[PDB]
Amino acid sequence: TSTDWKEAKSFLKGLSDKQREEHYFCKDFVRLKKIPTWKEMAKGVAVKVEEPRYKKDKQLNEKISLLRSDITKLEVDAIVNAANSSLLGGGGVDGCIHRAAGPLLTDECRTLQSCKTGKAKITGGYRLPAKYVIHTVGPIAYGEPSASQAAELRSCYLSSLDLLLEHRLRSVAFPCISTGVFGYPCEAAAEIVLATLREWLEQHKDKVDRLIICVFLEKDEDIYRSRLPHYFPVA
Ligand SMILES: Nc1ncnc2c1ncn2[C@@H]1O[C@H](COP(=O)(O)OP(=O)(O)OC[C@H]2O[C@H](O)[C@H](O)[C@@H]2O)[C@@H](O)[C@H]1O
């Protein structure tokens, strides 16, 4: 029981990544190689002219992706879970991740007992194509977030990336933390995420191959695609 997850986790750890594929809950996973970068995705896109706020950086544009997808399908080192402080699961992407990873994910989460807002903890990925899950707890906005809550949201992304770094992982996908059940406005969240990932990549670009913005609703897809050229200029 309380070593079930331990055994499975350690077991999957030894498998080659195409041995792992047989164990994935899905057969339609998305390999990282097939996820295009922002440098590629920006070819042919009309950037409406603006007062510039960032320098174009080819190399940083190679390390961020925006993708509309179910995040459980991404074959990356880690997907980030928009969790609750109890790590019990829930009806948003937390529920998709728990169902796709399996009941053994729940058992590891029980040993981690809680997660504070703006903080993060890592578990194994189990049946998920992703090797690990980084669980973080966003602020609960109730429509109109406070400045301290804008800081908590930024802090979920930084604590998540800090854990990536400590565990020497190089690919991660993020869902739109706090914007579902926790009610953060989608526009204000994306401004914070994009500013945060740019500055983080300025300082740590050598340590990762890809940060992925995994959006789920068209609304966030539209929001992010329109703000990406401001934070990651291409011309
Ligand atoms: N399968 C999916 N793949 C990727 N993104 C998804 C998926 N399903 C939903 N999203 C997007 O994920 C984004 C985040 O929405 P939410 O998941 O509510 O998270 P929160 O931080 O606001 O609420 C956390 C609470 O609810 C939780 O269940 C926890 O247990 C907590 O109790 C939205 O844009 C979704 O469209």
Side-chain angles (χ1 to χ4, degrees):
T1 53
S2 280
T3 49
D4 275 24
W5 68 264
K6 298 203 165 188
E7 301 173 25
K9 181 169 191 191
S10 320
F11 176 44
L12 302 135
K13 278 264 223 299
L15 295 190
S16 79
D17 298 342
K18 197 146 196 323
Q19 288 184 304
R20 312 184 43 244
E21 304 186 350
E22 287 69 354
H23 283 72
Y24 293 174
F25 86 98
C26 65
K27 258 49 163 138
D28 61 338
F29 51 96
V30 186
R31 298 178 204 265
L32 172 67
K33 61 150 105 151
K34 214 80 205 215
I35 299 190
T37 66
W38 170 232
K39 186 35 97 202
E40 303 173 79
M41 165 179 165
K43 307 302 173 192
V45 173
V47 183
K48 262 101 185 166
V49 188
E50 76 277 50
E51 173 180 29
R53 295 197 283 139
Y54 293 81
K55 283 156 154 131
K56 161 184 172 162
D57 189 331
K58 172 174 160 203
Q59 185 195 176
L60 305 195
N61 294 348
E62 291 173 336
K63 289 167 183 288
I64 192 162
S65 280
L66 165 70
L67 184 81
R68 195 173 166 213
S69 184
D70 182 336
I71 196 174
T72 66
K73 316 250 161 164
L74 308 185
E75 193 186 47
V76 288
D77 283 346
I79 64 181
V80 170
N81 176 21
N84 58 77
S85 90
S86 69
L87 306 180
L88 288 208
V93 62
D94 197 6
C96 302
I97 281 168
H98 277 79
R99 290 187 299 276
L104 291 175
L105 174 61
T106 303
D107 290 347
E108 185 164 16
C109 287
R110 287 197 172 116
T111 84
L112 310 178
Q113 308 194 25
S114 56
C115 188
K116 318 228 175 227
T117 302
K119 297 304 156 140
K121 306 195 171 176
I122 188 147
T123 66
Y126 305 97
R127 306 293 321 274
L128 285 175
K131 300 182 175 190
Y132 303 86
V133 176
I134 286 169
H135 309 253
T136 185
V137 180
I140 301 172
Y142 291 147
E144 192 38 77
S146 81
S148 157
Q149 284 182 304
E152 290 164 349
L153 182 57
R154 163 177 192 267
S155 187
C156 311
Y157 286 83
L158 294 178
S159 309
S160 285
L161 294 151
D162 281 2
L163 255 182
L164 201 79
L165 286 176
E166 283 154 23
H167 291 264
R168 290 169 298 113
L169 304 172
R170 309 181 52 83
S171 69
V172 68
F174 291 98
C176 290
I177 301 176
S178 275
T179 63
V181 179
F182 281 2
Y184 212 105
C186 298
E187 307 77 14
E191 295 298 323
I192 291 164
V193 173
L194 285 171
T196 297
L197 302 185
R198 173 67 189 233
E199 180 50 33
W200 193 90
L201 284 171
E202 295 273 12
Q203 303 169 47
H204 305 103
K205 62 197 186 49
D206 292 328
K207 318 290 242 160
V208 294
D209 298 309
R210 204 82 58 77
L211 318 185
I212 297 165
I213 306 178
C214 184
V215 298
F216 193 70
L217 322 169
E218 190 177 322
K219 166 187 179 51
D220 297 298
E221 191 185 13
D222 287 342
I223 287 174
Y224 273 94
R225 63 185 42 267
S226 71
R227 307 298 288 143
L228 251 168
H230 291 263
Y231 294 84
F232 289 79
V234 299

